[PDB]
RNA sequence: GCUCCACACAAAGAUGGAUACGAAUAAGGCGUCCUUGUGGCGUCGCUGAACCAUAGCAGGCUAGCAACGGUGCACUUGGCGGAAAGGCCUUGGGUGCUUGCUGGCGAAUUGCAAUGUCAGCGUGGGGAUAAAUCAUUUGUAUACGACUUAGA
RNA sequence: AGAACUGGCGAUGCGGGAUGAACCGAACGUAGAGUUAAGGUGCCGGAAUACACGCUCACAAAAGGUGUUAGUUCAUCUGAACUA
């Protein structure tokens, strides 16, 4: 109880070794991370991995991540990917909720009618299930 | 995109929420506005005063009766500043300032609607951080609308009633949100994970 | 089935206008779900029904329709201009216009 | 959503056959005739029956020019 | 727009029996080609005197980045009059090349001390190669060890006229 | 307002669903821990593109397999809502539905598009009920008006 | 005051200028489609509640600001006077 109450919000912070998703440009929905920082506002960004060309950007066009690793200052684009899997962040993201929503709304656009019939009977079922079963008690 | 939207003050500013109600009038898409008197508005409350009370010194020097009016119950200044933006003179905003009724807080039976919000209007986003601004139903009062304290009595009331259903209704769903958990990881249940689901 | 609309709804808004001086040639019809332009492409040319009653019983039905095409886009914000037949009423601004599917080229 | 025709005829008809001035008999028998292949041909596939009986209509918020048929 | 900067030689025209005159070269950052040779012809006429006409213009060329992945920073020695005659001034900027800069610096001449793209001119760009060399503080700021802050304040854009969200930045 | 006869509508823009805490936004929900905290732990958000609902002649007629569901309608208990409450939940039977599963018969000829469907009611003249008015009287009113009494 | 030249109005519509003899474009047969000038794109109203970096809280001319941002030149360890 002595101890404070002082806490907590903790928010992500612009960083070396952020990883960012780029939410609009040629990436729109990638992956990469911050080499190093120019000033309030603009900043540098890269990884092989996933494409994303090393660009200067200005923070507008791109949302952090809870997801960030080590690196040094200003590193360079084989240090970037060395570093990158060695934090093995694309199976860290991919775990995530997050990257699970992207994926989804990803997948429902691409649903055949067909398809999308399917999905029609099968939640027909399901639900009729979790109905049948529950609201016994 | 609902028939008719009910729309939320709070938070919000005047003249970005009063021309997006506006326009959509025009375009025909009925609106009932809550909560008048959580409204807000740019500047200090020093500032607002002056400009309502220099609309205040406006009359008709041969008789007031059909010179400049005034007006207090914050729907009354919201709808105002507002109509000012369609064109009542024609037919065209006659039919409009038809389809939207403000109110200040919500009455039945829109409490047990789903309120919504503007976001290109809401104060928190646009203002920025650290700088003045003033409450609607504040003002208001300050020009003579008499009927603040009753407001929150209202509001207290509702939002006692309002806090129990919220509960329960959130206390009902523990079961489906954790019933689902069985029907789970089922085929039909790995399938809609494999169709995008 | 409940829901038999095989056609995108919409919203009449105006004529195509100058600052003063309109032109009822050509409605501009505001589509329901198109945001931006590239979005519109899609639908440029399929046939806009705008679809009202009559008291009077004409054909032996009350509901009338004027019909016509939607040529191009308009603004950025996706509007796009439609002309029909005879020209829609003014009467309606902001009323609720169907656009259907067809012609269909995908 | 492909399927099979292979399995079945076509030349028995064109424009002529469809050519006009109820239901004439022979008309029906070629219905039948490419009724049972056709058919047994769709009970390859799962649903893909009902599929065929259903009818089609956009839901709300649907957004044909976002679809893929 | 995106600036672009030229290296440009005059080799303003050798008068009779004169060869070769000394060939005169200068780097100018445009937004294009013409603006460039405009621009080198205008100053040059000041410089010494010249006219447009009595010379002659030979080389043009776009020199591209030296690194452009390279954080660098910077300092700019400006001439621009208002209202009177100029104040030859000084700043630092901290970017990722030469033009990024120099595009900065002109927005922040318009921000501010309100002089147009007629009146500035750049004397003399350079890059600032060790640190500690930075005195404005604004600029060395960044220059610190383990820079970190976070989205001041997120502001999300909605692309809709609604939400029932009652957003938050987060 | 009721009853009778004669004769007229019907026995500013829809087409799945308007889908409900409140409060901050330099922060909050949700689950959970334990003493009950201004607590610990987890986690979420970065769109409603969501969520439910959705098959069947515009949605027929018929066979069962499971399960005691979900759903309609009308009877029906009970309680809540007076900010415009006219709304919501709920209990109990019947009635129909079922697509949770598998059946069988029907559709054309509307001929290759030109929605192609599926939002008791006033008239005018009787009979009757209760009025109100003119008129008459009065005077607190008054130019006319208008107003106030009394007249079973 | 009349001095000169040189335009525009007088005989003249049309887009914009909230409105106008002097302003910004623009030559007037009737129509169809396209593209622009000028001016604009919160709503009234057709068009980006676009993107970007910044500044501020709405003829009087010299000014005062223990305003505000950026710079100029002097000297210590931040100061002084100024400029924008």
Redesign the pocket.
Same mark, same amino acid.
Request: glycine share 6%; no cysteine; net charge positive.
């Given at each position: 109880?002595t101890?404070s109450?002082?806490?907590?919000?903790?928010?992500?912070l612009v960083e070396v070794g952020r990883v960012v998703?780029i939410?609009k440009g040629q990436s729109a929905g990638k992956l990469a991370a911050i080499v190093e920082i120019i000033?309030?506002?603009?900043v540098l960004i890269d990884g092989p991995k996933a494409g994303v060309p090393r660009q200067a950007i200005?923070?507008?066009?791109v949302?952090?991540?809870?997801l960030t690793f080590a690196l040094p200052r200003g590193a360079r684009t084989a240090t970037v990917s060395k570093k990158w899997a060695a934090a093995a962040v694309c199976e860290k993201w991919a775990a995530?909720?997050?990257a699970?929503?992207?994926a989804?709304?990803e997948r429902?656009?691409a649903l055949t009618d067909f398809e999308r019939?399917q999905?029609?009977?099968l939640?027909?079922?399901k639900?009729?299930?979790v109905?049948?079963a529950?609201?016994?008690a | 995109?609902?028939?008719?939207?009910?729309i939320?003050g709070?938070?919000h500013l005047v003249?970005?929420?009063?021309?997006?109600v506006?326009?959509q009038l025009?375009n025909?898409q009925?609106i009932?506005v809550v909560?008048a008197e959580?409204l807000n508005i740019?500047?200090?409350f020093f500032?607002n005063k002056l400009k309502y009370h220099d609309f205040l010194r406006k009359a008709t020097a041969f008789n007031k009766t059909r010179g400049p009016f005034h007006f207090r119950a914050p729907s009354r200044i919201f709808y105002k500043a507002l109509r000012?933006?369609?064109?009542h003179k024609?037919?065209?905003?006659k039919?409009?300032l038809?389809?939207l009724k403000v109110?200040?807080?919500?009455?039945?039976?829109?409490?047990?609607?789903?309120?919504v919000v503007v976001?290109?209007?809401?104060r928190?986003?646009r203002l920025?951080?650290?700088?003045?601004y003033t409450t609607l139903g504040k003002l208001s009062t300050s020009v003579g609308w008499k009927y603040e304290d009753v407001?929150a009595k209202?509001?207290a009331?509702?939002?006692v009633?309002?806090?129990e259903?919220?509960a329960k209704?959130?206390?009902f769903?523990?079961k489906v949100?954790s019933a689902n958990a069985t029907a789970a990881e089922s085929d039909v249940a790995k399938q809609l994970a494999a169709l995008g689901? | 089935?409940? +829901?038999? =609309?095989?056609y995108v709804?919409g919203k009449? &808004?105006?004529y195509?206008? +100058?600052? =003063?001086?309109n032109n009822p040639?050509?409605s &501009?019809i505001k589509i329901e779900g198109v945001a931006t332009p590239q979005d519109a492409q899609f639908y440029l040319g399929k046939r806009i029904?705008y679809?009202?009653?009559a008291?009077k019983?004409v054909?032996?039905?009350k509901?009338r329709?004027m019909?016509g095409k939607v040529?191009?886009t308009?603004?950025?914000?996706?509007?796009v201009?439609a002309?029909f037949r005879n020209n829609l009423?003014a009467?309606?601004?902001?009323?609720?216009v169907?656009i259907?599917l067809?012609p269909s080229n995908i | 959503t492909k399927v099979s025709v292979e399995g079945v005829n076509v030349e028995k008809f064109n424009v002529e056959y469809?050519?006009?001035?109820?239901?004439?008999a022979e008309?029906?028998e070629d219905?039948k005739v490419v009724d049972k292949a056709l058919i047994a041909e769709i009970?390859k596939t799962?649903?893909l029956?009902?599929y065929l009986?259903?009818?089609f209509?956009?839901?709300?918020?649907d957004?044909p020019h976002?679809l893929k048929f | 727009a995106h600036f672009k900067e030229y290296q440009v030689i005059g080799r303003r025209l050798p008068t009779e029996s004169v060869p070769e005159p000394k060939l005169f070269r200068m780097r100018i950052f445009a937004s294009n080609e013409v603006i460039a040779k405009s621009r080198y012809w205008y100053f040059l006429q000041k410089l010494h005197k010249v006219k447009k006409a009595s010379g002659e213009i030979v080389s043009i060329n776009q020199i591209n980045e030296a690194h452009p992945t390279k954080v660098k920073n910077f300092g700019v020695w400006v001439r621009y009059d208002?209202?009177?005659g100029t104040?030859?001034?000084?700043?630092?900027i901290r970017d990722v090349s030469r033009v990024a800069a120099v595009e900065?610096l002109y927005?922040?001449m318009?921000?501010?001390?309100?002089?147009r793209f007629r009146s500035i001119h750049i004397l003399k760009v350079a890059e600032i190669e060790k640190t500690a060399d930075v005195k404005?503080q604004?600029?060395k700021q960044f220059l610190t060890k383990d820079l970190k802050f976070?989205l001041?304040?997120?502001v999300?854009?909605?692309?809709?006229?609604?939400?029932?969200?009652?957003?938050?930045?987060?």
């Open positions: 109880s101890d109450i002082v806490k907590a919000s903790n928010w992500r998703l939410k000033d309030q506002k603009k200005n923070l507008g066009q949302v952090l991540t809870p995530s909720s997050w699970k929503k992207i989804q709304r429902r656009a019939f999905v029609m009977v939640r027909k079922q639900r009729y299930t109905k049948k529950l609201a016994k | 995109v609902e028939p008719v939207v009910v939320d709070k938070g003249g970005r929420l009063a021309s997006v506006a326009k025009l025909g009925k009932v909560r959580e740019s500047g200090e500032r000012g933006m369609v064109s024609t037919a065209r905003g039919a409009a038809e389809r109110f200040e807080g919500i009455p039945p039976p829109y409490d047990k609607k789903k309120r976001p290109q209007a809401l928190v986003l920025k951080p650290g700088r003045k407001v209202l509001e009331k509702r939002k009633s309002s806090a259903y919220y209704k959130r206390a769903t523990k949100a689901y | 089935a409940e +829901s038999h =609309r095989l709804k009449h &808004l105006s195509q206008r +100058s600052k =003063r001086v040639n050509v &501009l029904a679809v009202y009653r008291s019983e054909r032996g039905s509901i329709v019909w040529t191009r308009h603004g950025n914000s996706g509007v201009r002309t009423p009467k309606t601004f902001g009323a609720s169907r259907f067809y | 469809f050519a006009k001035e109820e239901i004439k008309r029906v219905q009970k799962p649903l029956k009902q009986s259903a009818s209509s956009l839901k709300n918020g957004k976002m | 208002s209202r009177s104040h030859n001034m000084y700043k630092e900065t927005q922040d318009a921000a501010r001390h309100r002089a404005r604004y600029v976070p001041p304040h997120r999300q854009k909605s692309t809709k006229t609604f939400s029932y969200k009652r957003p938050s930045t987060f």
